[PDB]
């Protein structure tokens, strides 16, 4: 039965299809080449960087490698804040608070484990260890300082309290690993990217899926919200960013290029949402106009794979992590 | 052209990249084995000898080892097999008495071997469960006779006979059944291989 | 708990060698940055010592440099002070201040408890004119001081701390960079204005703000304080 069901999904899909966006945007005006140089160079690490987040400040970013360490520096002068060591070496994502008083550090482990960065003792101290997840923990997003959804290797993400520690909820949708989560500006819905190369609409309310978004073919490294918060683009192994649309459905556009092989690692947005940043695996990543699909740009300043990508909330600065323990924050 | 606080700023931050690389150097000098196995193969008498990871640590003459076991995390291993590259080597193991189908080990030995992020580390195959296979041999496409001396041999010969990168790769095979506190021996002899290759380079000689 | 307990007070004749212990607990000692102000029994605050968080950025003000020495005891988290030719004006009580400096961090946040010290017998400067303000309980003070140079550094930060000591306790921090208010204090107390000129702003004022409230620079060592200003009924 469900197979007219995904039939008639495709029949209504097209039928609200009536003009690309490529027909609509032709005539804007290109925005030109892009300068990007490199304005410092963040340099603390002994081993592959993995994951970084910039705090709501625009000012302090925290990133977390494989020996054993989360760092929280002070972007603007390069200084060091904090360094917290971990009991699992085995990290693969990180996350800040948006009040700036804890930080989050998943990975092999299974166990996301909240930091208290303001103590009167004078130290970090990990607050709790939330512990209910059987697979890899990928990635972990606050909602504020007493939520928090995760995301892990054994099909499913869900949503914790941590006062209690509990699991409040639990999304079970996907068939296949999920390596990527992005949240909502309002924070009331967000999505996650599977490993089944699709994408699905959850709803943290009431926890349900609400729309499921595919057109890829390999699985899905990375996803980021339209600053508007009416789209997201998507990044594959297939070497293929995409930008989908929530009110439609539908895909809107797709980015590729003949002399990319290698699979995306990470993106993102500008604070207009004019421009879409994606990490390769080529060692360097790109500027892709978000309307004309061509290229403005390329940020090629890493001697190994770029693993990590975010722009502050002010957009004022972009910053890339890479495999070679070098944080660049690029402007 | 500094504020008082800054500079103290600056010196907190200069104290933080001294222990960092304080403890780099402690960790740079510790002997790292990835354990993978195939279930059932005996991962438990090699542990004994000596939800998510697990991690164990010994000291064999002055050296400090540390054998993380993935074993139970039940996921694609594509996704976090890149985070072992680097591994010192890797203990594979597997039990002579499941000939539980030995296709699966192999295939899973082809996958370890014949891979990126591993195309120049040493597997130190061990064979367990010596014993039970030679009682069952002993009852129970190969040419000969159904006896231990060759048996072992020929199995020998068909694990070492799936790397392709037949050169610039050593897979050191041992087998052991009593536990006879050598199978440690083998381990520091196979590390110690590894660490002389890896002061080749590093002193420019290559 | 976090309890910071002295020593080594007494009677002392001129010219001595007195030594102060200064016993940590219950908190990271070992990455706290540590000062020794102290206090003339009829007068205000003067800075006295430095020894940073891993020794080996001391300082010292003037009418000491010379004669005192600061050393940290790590292993056993103690601070001692120790004093050479002991002349009759050194009479006052020591405190045993904790601060840490990181971006967004808050200097000077606990005191120690006192240690009553009776020897026998191109700064900064900070006013803080009309001392002894009357008020009733109904609200709205307003006490005003004013510095020498700027303390509006060029990277934004306008390093001008308040302190309030209440009778017979020792002072706690209230507003630390002019804007920032130090946790543990109510929401009444606010801060503000621009260079060489500042105005701590009280409302809804209670019973138990009543006490002498001195403002502290931290541009440049040395570190200076105001004259005080209590506050009465």
């Known amino acids: 039965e469900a197979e007219q069901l995904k039939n008639q999904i495709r029949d209504a899909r097209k039928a609200c299809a009536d003009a690309t966006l490529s027909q609509i945007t032709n005539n804007i005006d290109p925005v030109g080449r892009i300068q990007m140089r490199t304005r410092r160079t963040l340099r603390g690490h002994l081993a592959k960087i993995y994951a970084m987040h910039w705090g709501t400040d625009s000012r302090l970013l925290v990133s977390a490698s494989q020996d054993g360490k989360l760092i929280i520096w002070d972007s603007y002068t390069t200084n060091k804040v904090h360094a917290i060591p971990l009991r699992s070496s085995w990290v693969m994502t990180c996350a800040y608070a948006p009040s700036g008083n804890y930080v989050a550090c998943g990975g092999l482990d299974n166990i996301c484990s909240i930091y208290n960065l303001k103590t009167r003792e004078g130290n970090v101290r990990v607050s709790r260890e939330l512990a209910g997840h059987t697979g890899y923990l990928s990635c972990c997003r606050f909602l504020d300082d007493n939520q928090i959804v995760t995301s892990s290797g054994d099909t499913t993400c869900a949503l914790w309290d941590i006062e209690t520690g509990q699991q409040t909820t639990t999304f079970t949708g996907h068939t296949g690993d999920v390596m990527s989560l992005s949240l909502a500006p309002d924070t009331r819905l967000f999505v996650s990217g599977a490993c089944d190369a699709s994408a699905k609409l959850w709803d943290v309310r009431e926890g349900m899926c609400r729309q499921t978004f595919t057109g890829h073919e390999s699985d899905i490294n990375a996803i980021c919200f339209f600053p508007n918060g009416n789209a997201f683009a998507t990044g594959s192994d297939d070497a293929t960013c995409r930008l989908f649309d929530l009110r439609a459905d539908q895909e809107l556009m797709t980015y590729s290029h003949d002399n990319i092989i290698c699979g995306i690692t990470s993106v993102s947005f500008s604070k207009s949402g004019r421009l879409l940043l994606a990490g390769y695996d080529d060692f360097n990543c790109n500027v892709w106009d978000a309307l004309k699909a061509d290229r403005a740009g390329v940020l090629a300043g890493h001697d190994n794979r770029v693993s990590c990508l975010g722009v502050t909330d002010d957009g004022m600065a972009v910053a890339t992590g890479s495999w070679d323990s070098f944080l660049k924050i690029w402007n | 052209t500094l504020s008082a606080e800054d500079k103290a700023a600056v010196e907190r931050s200069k104290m933080i990249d001294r222990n960092l690389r304080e403890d780099g150097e402690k960790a740079a000098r510790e002997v790292k084995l990835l354990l993978l196995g195939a279930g059932e193969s005996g991962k438990s008498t090699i542990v004994k000898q000596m939800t998510g990871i697990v991690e164990t640590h010994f000291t064999f003459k002055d050296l400090h080892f540390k054998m993380f076991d993935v074993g139970a995390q039940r996921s694609e291993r594509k996704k976090w097999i890149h985070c072992f590259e680097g591994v010192t080597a890797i203990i594979f193991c597997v039990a002579l008495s499941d000939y539980n189908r030995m296709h699966e080990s192999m295939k899973l030995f082809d996958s370890i071997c014949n891979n990126k992020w591993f195309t120049d580390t040493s597997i130190i195959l061990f064979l367990n469960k010596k014993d039970l296979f030679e009682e069952k041999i002993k009852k129970s496409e190969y040419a000969g006779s159904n006896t231990y001396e060759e048996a072992a041999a020929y199995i020998q010969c068909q694990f070492e006979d799936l790397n392709k990168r037949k050169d610039t790769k050593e897979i050191y095979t041992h087998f052991t059944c009593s536990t006879d506190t050598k199978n440690v021996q083998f381990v520091f002899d196979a590390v110690t291989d590894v660490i002389i290759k890896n002061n080749l380079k590093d002193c420019g000689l290559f | 708990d976090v309890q910071l307990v002295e020593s080594g007070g007494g009677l002392v004749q001129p010219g001595g060698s007195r030594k102060l212990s200064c016993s940590a607990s219950?908190?990271?000692?070992?990455?706290?940055?540590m000062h020794w102000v102290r206090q003339a029994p009829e007068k205000g605050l003067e800075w006295v010592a430095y020894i940073s968080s891993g020794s080996g950025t001391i300082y010292y003000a003037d009418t000491v440099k010379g004669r005192f020495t600061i050393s940290r005891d790590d292993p056993k988290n103690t601070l001692f002070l120790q004093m050479t030719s002991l002349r009759s004006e050194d009479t006052a009580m020591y405190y045993c201040?904790?601060?840490?400096?990181?971006?967004?961090?808050?200097?000077?946040?606990?005191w120690g408890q006192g240690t009553t010290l009776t020897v026998s017998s191109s700064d900064i400067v900070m006013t803080q004119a009309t001392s002894s303000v009357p008020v009733t309980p109904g609200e709205s003070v307003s006490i005003s001081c004013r510095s020498s140079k700027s303390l509006l550094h060029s990277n934004g930060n306008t390093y001008l701390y308040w302190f309030l000591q209440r009778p017979g306790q020792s002072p706690q921090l209230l507003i630390y960079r002019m804007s920032n208010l130090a946790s543990g204090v109510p929401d009444r107390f606010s801060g503000s204005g621009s260079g060489t000129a500042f105005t701590l702003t009280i409302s809804r004022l209670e019973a138990e703000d009543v006490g002498v409230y001195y403002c502290m620079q931290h541009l440049e060592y040395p570190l200076t304080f105001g004259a005080g200003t209590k506050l009465e009924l």
């Open positions: 201040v904790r601060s840490i400096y990181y971006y967004g961090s808050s200097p000077f946040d606990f």
């Open positions: 219950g908190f990271a000692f070992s990455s706290f940055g």
